Design a protein around this ligand. Structure first.
Ligand code: 0GJ
Lengths: 247, 135
């Protein structure tokens, strides 16, 4: 996340940190963000897993907070199912169907048990989005500049505004590389944005006064670049897909 | 190729002292938080004492406060547990366990230790500590 503030407990308790395992007793490497949509299910971006789409390579952590005491029995999860969208494609600049579902369980086989620091996030009604210009909040451990290589140490959150497709599909923006299964969002002052390492993390907009996973961090030319909003998987157009993989 | 191995087990008179050591091979133990857990013949596994990777945070079960002392050496790839004023109640199999604590949590290793060690990544096979008048 570029610009914005560092977060605490209960601020994004649906947030999931997704790590890739290293061989040997080497600690895993942070790979992507995610959102707890069900006690057993995390939604994230497919592009995060396309190189190594086997579930054994990942481990998910929940309830991150500076006031949360790490408990591996309840906060660490193996991935028992990793599902990428079957029509995920990489285009010239955009990703298509950039979404993935991770079924998680603890070492004793439980799903996520709610707490002050672990909550699910509600999905939008079908094809329903907050109006353009709405304030949504983004969250992650991604770079704090584009030009940086460093990932931050603690959880960050920021506020971006929804940008209409008409404005986003202007040629000096993204032109025809934005379709309606995507959602653009940016800082009107172009100083805050999500960046490398935020993919799969949430875009939380208020649907009728209720926090809602509207987007999943997917791509963008640069980070916080003028005329270049962050692009997000539009969750409202994937509800059937999602609920077809759960039930 | 990851291996954890405890050592130091034996039979000691009540009130006596005993030191355990956990050695690692195949990986760098210094990146890991380490917990000493024990299982008594009747009970289930409980956290005795834990220490964070840098050695800055420790936790002790109430049963052993002021009697047991955990420490570590990340140059020698070990974690020690000094046990003083031993009581018969301490008689158990003592396991060493290692877990990588991700960033973004509290500095404490309290929850790592209070929860009977469920979820800890790596385990040693354990060493026997027996406290009895038979010694
Ligand atoms: C994979 C996912 O974590 C990132 C998220 C980047 C968010 N984009 C913006 N504008 N906030 N998505 C990608 O890496 C997809 N590819 C790109 O964004 C590249 N055009 C830029 C690569 C880079 O800057 O690291």
């Amino acid at each position: 996340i570029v610009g914005g503030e560092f977060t605490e407990v209960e601020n994004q308790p649906w947030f999931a940190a997704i790590y890739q395992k290293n061989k040997g007793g080497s600690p895993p490497s942070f790979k992507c963000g995610g959102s707890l949509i069900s006690p057993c299910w995390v939604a994230s971006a497919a592009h995060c897993f396309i190189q190594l789409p086997k579930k054994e390579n990942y481990v998910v952590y929940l309830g991150q907070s500076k006031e949360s005491s790490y408990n591996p029995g309840e906060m660490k999860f193996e991935v028992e199912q990793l599902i990428l969208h079957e029509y995920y494609r990489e285009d010239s600049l955009a990703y298509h169907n950039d979404i993935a579902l991770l079924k998680i369980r603890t070492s004793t086989g439980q799903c996520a048990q709610p707490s002050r620091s672990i909550q699910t996030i509600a999905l939008p009604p079908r094809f329903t989005d907050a109006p353009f210009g709405s304030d949504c909040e983004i969250t992650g451990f991604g770079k704090e500049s584009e030009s940086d290589y460093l990932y931050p140490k603690n959880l960050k959150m920021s506020v971006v505004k929804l940008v209409s497709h008409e404005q986003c599909m202007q040629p000096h923006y993204y032109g025809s590389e934005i379709n309606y299964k995507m959602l653009c969002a940016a800082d009107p002052e172009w100083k805050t944005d999500s960046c490398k390492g935020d993919s799969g993390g949430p875009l939380i907009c208020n649907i009728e006064g209720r926090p809602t996973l509207s987007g999943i961090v997917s791509w963008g030319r640069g980070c916080a670049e003028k005329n270049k909003p962050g692009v997000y998987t539009r969750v409202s157009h994937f509800l059937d897909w999602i609920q077809s993989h759960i039930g | 190729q990851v291996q954890l191995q405890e050592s130091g087990g034996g039979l000691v008179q009540p009130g006596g002292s005993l030191r355990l050591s956990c050695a690692a091979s195949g990986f760098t133990l210094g990146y890991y938080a380490i917990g000493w857990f024990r299982r008594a013949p009747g009970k289930e596994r409980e956290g005795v004492s834990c220490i964070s990777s840098s050695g800055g945070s420790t936790n002790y079960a109430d049963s052993v406060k002021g009697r047991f002392t955990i420490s570590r050496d990340n140059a020698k790839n070990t974690v020690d547990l000094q046990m003083n004023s031993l009581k018969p109640e301490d008689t158990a199999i003592y396991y060493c366990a290692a877990e990588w604590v991700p960033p973004g949590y509290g500095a404490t290793v309290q929850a790592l230790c209070n929860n009977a060690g469920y979820g800890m990544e790596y385990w040693g096979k354990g060493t026997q500590v027996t406290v009895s008048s038979a010694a």
